[PDB]
Amino acid sequence: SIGPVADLTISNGAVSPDGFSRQAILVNDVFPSPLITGNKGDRFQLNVIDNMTNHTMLKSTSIHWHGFFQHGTNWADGPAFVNQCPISTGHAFLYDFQVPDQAGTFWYHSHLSTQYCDGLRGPIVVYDPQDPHKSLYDVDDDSTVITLADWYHLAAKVGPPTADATLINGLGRSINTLNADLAVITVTKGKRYRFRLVSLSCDPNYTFSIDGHSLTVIEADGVNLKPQTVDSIQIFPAQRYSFVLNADQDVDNYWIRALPNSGTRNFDGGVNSAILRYEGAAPVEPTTSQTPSTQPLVESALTTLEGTAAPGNPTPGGVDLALNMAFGFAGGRFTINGASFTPPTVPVLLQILSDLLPSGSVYSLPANADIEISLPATSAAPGFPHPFHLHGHTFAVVRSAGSSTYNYANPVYRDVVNTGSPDNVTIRFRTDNPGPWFLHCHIDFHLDAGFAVVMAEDTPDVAATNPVPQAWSDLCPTYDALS
Ligand SMILES: *[C@@H]1O[C@H](CO)[C@@H](O)[C@H](O)[C@H]1NC(C)=O
Ligand SMILES: *[C@@H]1O[C@H](CO)[C@@H](O)[C@H](O)[C@H]1NC(C)=O
Ligand SMILES: [Cu+2]
Ligand SMILES: [Cu+2]
Ligand SMILES: [Cu+2]
Ligand SMILES: [Cu+2]
């Protein structure tokens, strides 16, 4: 793997992760993008070298480092026209930030239009030398990262959508390439694995299970939690989980299954599937049967390892500022409280540094306060369920999707939450991270359609807390000169 100091060169190339050839986005000449790695407290210097020539997938790029807090380095966070102008082709831009107090499973991806759907997306693992669950597993390496990804034969900016295939570790089969190579995951009988599940999906959620094995979940979106055995896991776009697998079954091949909520909802011919292979097992497809899932993961039954409480007082409205976000759908555009987000000419953070634009979308947040955000599900926002995600913060899921109850005493903490179907998912966080932070649904087409708002956190202090490198100031004129 690479990092925490590395070059990321972005280019275009042919790929065939399902046997069908299409042009896509490469990171250091490989599809899918390589895993980045660091220890807790490393300083990260990821030099992003834009060498793209393909206009249909945009020649420009910017990278968000999903989950990282970016305290004092809001300029480094990624979202085009919120925190930076995009890097232009022929140029490079250094992302220089630290991760002092985060550790766990994360990822990086394009935050420009729909560009990460064309293959610029990759796992990040920040190991903890003192990890609290270390004693529960023997192996925790590059071989135990598992990524889930949707794959489309025609580019993001080519059709509307429906995945042609599911990619586990970059490999999978579509309905017309049932013979294509599958992803193989190799364990040794009697060893224990910390598997790091990473959804790179642009849209589908996956119900993930492994034939013949139970999963003990110990981490969600970077947050250590109390161990919790399950036999399947619903993972929504941009979410992460660590589960320990006790490789204690017979030496054999076992189907790994990852079934999307949309499109091809079967396992016929090994679509939506990969292979757990015990060492010594033959190089064949598994022939194992799947059991009905009798202990699925339940977000409202998850709790933080330390049992941390929700910020604020343990009662609704028991907070410094309650904001309710009302979803809708106008032209071809999503709306929250009546605003559709259109990317502004001057990125928000630059406006601050210079009411913010785009009007109707920007929410001033005071510092050192408790915030409660409501996001009731509604049929007025088609394409639900929507997984909303808050940059620059972990939040406490005081009430999950599918539930009516309210947990303030020890709710799970996360950075991406399913908001459910027409449900009133509510979250809490403390404002200790001054800057403009994107709040948006992570189904990436809905995002390009404007399904987003920006939290302008402690705006009087953003100028002081986030000094900006010369290279970042150079970004916008360069971009604006391009036709
Ligand atoms: C650029 O990528 C698009 C999207 O996959 C593809 O349709 C097009 O052929 C590519 N351009 C070239 C010159 O290969
Ligand atoms: C969701 O919860 C907030 C919290 O008070 C409330 O104001 C809002 O009306 C609720 N919406 C629905 C649809 O239940
Ligand atoms: Cu993300
Ligand atoms: Cu993010
Ligand atoms: Cu959505
Ligand atoms: Cu985002």
Residue-wise DSSP of 285-350: ---PPPPP-SSB--GGG--BTT-PPPSS-SSTT-SSEEEE--EEE-SS-EEETTBPP---SS-HHH
300: which 2 tokens?
């409202």
Q: Is the CB of 155 under 6 A from ligand 1?
A: yes
Pairing of the two strands 435-441 and 387-390:
antiparallel
Q: What is the DSSP letter of 267?
A: -
Q: Is the CB of 23 under 6 A from ligand 1?
A: yes
* Resolution at which this structure was determined, Å: 2.3
Give the largest CA-CA distance in the chain. 65
CATH of domain 307-483: 2.60.40.420
Same fold, 133-306 and 307-483: yes
Q: What is the dihedral of CA 334, 335, 340, 341, to 10 degrees?
A: -80
Collapsing DSSP states into helix, strand and coil, what is residue 475? helix
Quick one: which H or E segment has residue 463? Answer: helix 459-465
Check residue 41 and give left, alpha or beta (phi > 0: left; psi -120 to 50: alpha): left
HSE-up of residue 278 (Cα within 13 Å, Cβ side): 20
Q: Is the CB of 324 under 6 A from ligand 2?
A: yes
Q: Is the CB of 54 under 6 A from ligand 1?
A: yes
Annotated domain spans of the chain: 1-132, 133-306, 307-483
* Phi and psi at residue 73, to the nearest 5°: -135, 45
128: which 2 tokens?
């903890």
Q: Among 297, 304, 298, which Cα is nearest to 395's?
A: 304
Tell me if the domain spanning 133-306 has CATH number 1.20.58.1910: no
Query: Which CA distances in Å does 125 have to 103, 236, 389, 469, 470?
Result: 8, 19, 19, 26, 29
Q: How many CB atoms lie within 10 A of CB 404?
A: 9
Q: Among 480, 366, 369, 388, which Cα is nearest to 438's?
A: 388
Q: Among 342, 347, 344, which Cα is nearest to 332's?
A: 342
426: which 2 tokens?
């509510």
Pocket test for ligand 2, best of 319, 323, 372, 374 (most atoms within 8 A of CB): 374
Contact predicate 126/38, CB 8 Å: yes
Pocket test for ligand 2, best of 321, 324, 378 (most atoms within 8 A of CB): 324
Asked if omega into 32 is within 30° of 0 (cis), the reply is: yes
Structure-determination technique: X-ray
Q: Among 445, 340, 457, 444, which Cα is nearest to 392's?
A: 457
For ligand 4, a single-atom ion, the residues with CB < 5 A are 66, 391
Q: Atom 13, ligand 2: which residue's CA is nearest?
A: 376
- The label of the residue with tokens 């161990």 reads 227
Q: Is the CB of 378 under 6 A from ligand 2?
A: no
Fold (topology level) of 1-132: Immunoglobulin-like (2.60.40)
